Design a protein around this ligand. Sequence first.
Ligand code: HEM
Ligand SMILES: OC[C@H]1O[C@H](O[C@H]2[C@H](O)[C@@H](O)[C@H](OCCCCCC3CCCCC3)O[C@@H]2CO)[C@H](O)[C@@H](O)[C@@H]1O
Ligand SMILES: CC1(C)[C@H]2CC[C@]1(C)CC2
Length: 461
Amino acid sequence: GKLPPGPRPLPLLGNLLQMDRRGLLKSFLRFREKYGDVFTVHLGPRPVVMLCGVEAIREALVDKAEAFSGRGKIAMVDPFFRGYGVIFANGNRWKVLRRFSVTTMRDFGRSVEERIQEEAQCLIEELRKSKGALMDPTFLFQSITANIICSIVFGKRFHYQDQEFLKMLNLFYQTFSLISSVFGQLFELFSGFLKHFPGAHRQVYKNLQEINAYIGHSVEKHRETLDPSAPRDLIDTYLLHMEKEKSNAHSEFSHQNLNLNTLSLFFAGTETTSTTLRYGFLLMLKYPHVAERVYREIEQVIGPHRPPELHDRAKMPYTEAVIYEIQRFSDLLPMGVPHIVTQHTSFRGYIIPKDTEVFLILSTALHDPHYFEKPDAFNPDHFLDANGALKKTEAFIPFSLGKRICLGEGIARAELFLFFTTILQNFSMASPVAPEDIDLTPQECGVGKIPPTYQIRFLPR
Ligand code: HEM
Ligand SMILES: OC[C@H]1O[C@H](O[C@H]2[C@H](O)[C@@H](O)[C@H](OCCCCCC3CCCCC3)O[C@@H]2CO)[C@H](O)[C@@H](O)[C@@H]1O
Ligand SMILES: CC1(C)[C@H]2CC[C@]1(C)CC2
């Protein structure tokens, strides 16, 4: 009848002295051993409710969507976003921006499938030209995923050799890392105090403004060349709404929503799928038998010449299982994205008051040992039955659930499929590190789980 139980806080420090030095997620998993799946932690000055396991998270996000569909802040980026753009919006702003983004994410995508297929052929050409050299593949995994969203948002794609484009990708990469660092986790507890000192929050803010400066320019160039009878892309479509609603001072189709919604789509469109690819190829280097078996399946179902297509998925249970398992193992957003309850809500006999922040600990569903035997190991059979047919599970929720479920889920799974199969169709992988010596420990583990840097060669078949 009050908040969920948890560790007794100290004034100012909240539960700091009970935390694990290894980070937030490790701290919360230690609290779960003691308190169970629903508990409260005081992150510096404020209580945050944690929900763990797929039952509690689905009860909240699906069964109680009228209460658990608010968005909380991520302290390291709130000073930049300030509640603008679909990711960080609440209330009617969110409603408008969410419907807008979904409709225009769709109806310019001509089809998404064709754009990913074309990007995948550019990528295969780029990898051929690299002549089996060693590379850290981060920049190309970023380029290809960024380019899909660029084609919908900006109506164009950028060349892999373009230093400017590269410069923006570097900023997405550094920024997601700094958000996820130990400092970024400490900022989440003590931003009230730490914001007054130098630190990585200032670097994040600067990177995000540098990306936003490009968006603002591109908006300006679109404004100048706009033809209301044929919008080219999502920016044109938003500009036409802004024109329709111009006599309303309170229209949500504002310039700040335009720039930060666009940045939002971009950043999420790029860095999420790119990081999942980076983990996926590291996992292929450590488990080359899995890569060999996917390749077998591509030979038998697709053959060595015809481009993979989405229709191939249903015939390729092994490859779909491997990608599910990459997503489950790589656990991109272990604590998901913060929510907030929008009205006083009862939950499992507790009372969670309006405006309390809620974290859905997606990582606990992804590693549920009732749904996945050996959840700490990479094993595609987590997603196969005895017959080797695909076995989907309701514990697989790396995109979350309910009203704020990832709006990019379809696009992301299309990209993973098409890029992973197209690459393995044309190339096998090698590197200087023996599989037994490859260390999968993430380089950062905070809001994001971010794999270590590594070198790889793509060898033409
Ligand atoms: C592996 C790829 C991806 C994963 C694992 C992922 C995961 C997620 C998760 C866990 C959330 C939070 C949902 C919540 O608040 O409970 C989210 C939100 C979001 N993602 Fe994705 N994402 C991926 C790719 C993408 C792509 C490719 C796009 C854009 C095309 C995208 C756009 C968004 C947006 C706009 C939101 C905010 C939704 C809202 O607040 O209404 N994501 N994502
Ligand atoms: O907008 C004020 C700033 O703009 C000038 O910047 C240009 C550069 O001269 C110009 O070379 C540059 O090119 C970026 C092209 C690639 C865009 C990549 C996109 C990928 C997806 C997400 C958004 C960016 O972007 C900047 C913004 O227009 C300068 O960079 C800076 O002085 C100044 O801070
Ligand atoms: C802000 C982000 C780090 C970016 C990728 C995940 C996220 C939490 C939403 C968009």
